[PDB]
Amino acid sequence: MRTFFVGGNWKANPKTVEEAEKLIEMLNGAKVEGNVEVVVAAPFYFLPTLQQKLRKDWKVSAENVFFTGEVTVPMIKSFGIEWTILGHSERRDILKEDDEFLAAKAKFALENGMKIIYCCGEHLSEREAGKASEFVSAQIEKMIPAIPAGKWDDVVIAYEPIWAIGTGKVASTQDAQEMCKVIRDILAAKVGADIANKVRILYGGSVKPNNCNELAACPDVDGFLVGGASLEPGFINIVNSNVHSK
Amino acid sequence: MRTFFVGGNWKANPKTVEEAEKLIEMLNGAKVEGNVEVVVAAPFYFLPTLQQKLRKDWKVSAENVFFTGEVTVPMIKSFGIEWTILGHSERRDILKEDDEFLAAKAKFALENGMKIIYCCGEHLSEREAGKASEFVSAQIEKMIPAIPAGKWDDVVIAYEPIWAIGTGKVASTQDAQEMCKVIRDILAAKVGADIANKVRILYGGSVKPNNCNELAACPDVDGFLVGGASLEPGFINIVNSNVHSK
Numbered sequence A, B: 001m002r003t004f005f006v007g008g009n010w011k012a013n014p015k016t017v018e019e020a021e022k023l024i025e026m027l028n029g030a031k032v033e034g035n036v037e038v039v040v041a042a043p044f045y046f047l048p049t050l051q052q053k054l055r056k057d058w059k060v061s062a063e064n065v066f067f068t069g070e071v072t073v074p075m076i077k078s079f080g081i082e083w084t085i086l087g088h089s090e091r092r093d094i095l096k097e098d099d100e101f102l103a104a105k106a107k108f109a110l111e112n113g114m115k116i117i118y119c120c121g122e123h124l125s126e127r128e129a130g131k132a133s134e135f136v137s138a139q140i141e142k143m144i145p146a147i148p149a150g151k152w153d154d155v156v157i158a159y160e161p162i163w164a165i166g167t168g169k170v171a172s173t174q175d176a177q178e179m180c181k182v183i184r185d186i187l188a189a190k191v192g193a194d195i196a197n198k199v200r201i202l203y204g205g206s207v208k209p210n211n212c213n214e215l216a217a218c219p220d221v222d223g224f225l226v227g228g229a230s231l232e233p234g235f236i237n238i239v240n241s242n243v244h245s246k
Ligand code: NA
Pocket: A215, A216, A217, A218, A219, A220, A221, A222, A223, A244, A245, A246
């Protein structure tokens, strides 16, 4: 039985420390139902505030980790931050973060006691070419050798349908399920069923209060990496969709 | 009379918040001599600590400013952080931060009430080709049109001899003076003598307690952007080299 997992990615939000404090006060009062592991990723400047004020049953995450302008594992590790996102689509696409680089980063983060939300997902061209499975499989196949023995408990994988983000195309609930299953099957083929059965695989497309319950019920969807809704009152609805996941 | 300026760039240091707190306690006790404007740039995670604990006669700076993983002007602006470094050689070279991008960033930062330490400097090939002046002039010539009317009081320019960083070549005191003068002359040619006479131009090569006094005395050198020494007790010696600058 895999514990449902919801990560809230604030991205470059909110605008001020006062707004971050108000968001934290609201999350601290949220009534969680069911069984669910919740992590909140926030800009670097705000992590100290989160680590001090956020409900201790939830954990704080970096949105990325690393010279001038860059932030490192010991600093966040030394702050008591245990999680990072890696390979988020925005960073892959906009900043050309590549797979060798990213699998290398996962290896390094895990070797240093970090837990990771490792993002993957295909673009519109590969989806339209009928190569979505092939592309995503390749991404995970590059990730797999980077995971140290004994560290699979510290890995969560997030599927981002990049083909449906800013393109004029939308993903269905079935699309989410199918691509999460693709991921689980490649894990099973390469590292075995015990690993495949315990790794949480998340849907990282558009998740809102109006589609979370339907998505949660999908058998290979173990949770969400949430964007904009993480800043809104409906984040708790998404956390609580775990009750629909068998 | 331009006020001498020393910026300390901690880069990706120190390793822990406790070490940052100890460094701040040491800087807070430092006896400043002469007249000098001091700014300390630190990793994002540490800026809240600096803004709260660092001596209020000094100002805190971001090492850079901006999606997932990125940090923005309102957040730092909203924290009361008034300075950023822009165009640091490490970010230009390693991450391909280009001139149009960087002049665009300066325009945007200044339009939003930020003061900037704008970095320039040539690589070994252009230095060896006899094109150092030409290359640096071009960089500043791209920067100039980006500065809004009335904002030149909020700009400091740092010359980084990239050709002497990690290459096996060292820069002389005369090299620093000449390239700072190159910068001042291009300002004079393009935007006039009043602007050229008030803009602080800094040396951003290797600055230590053993060469700061000699460098400070150079007539077109108005201060320093300090790397590794900013983390060490000799940073105060560098701040106090202003007494040698006429
Ligand atoms: Na499910």
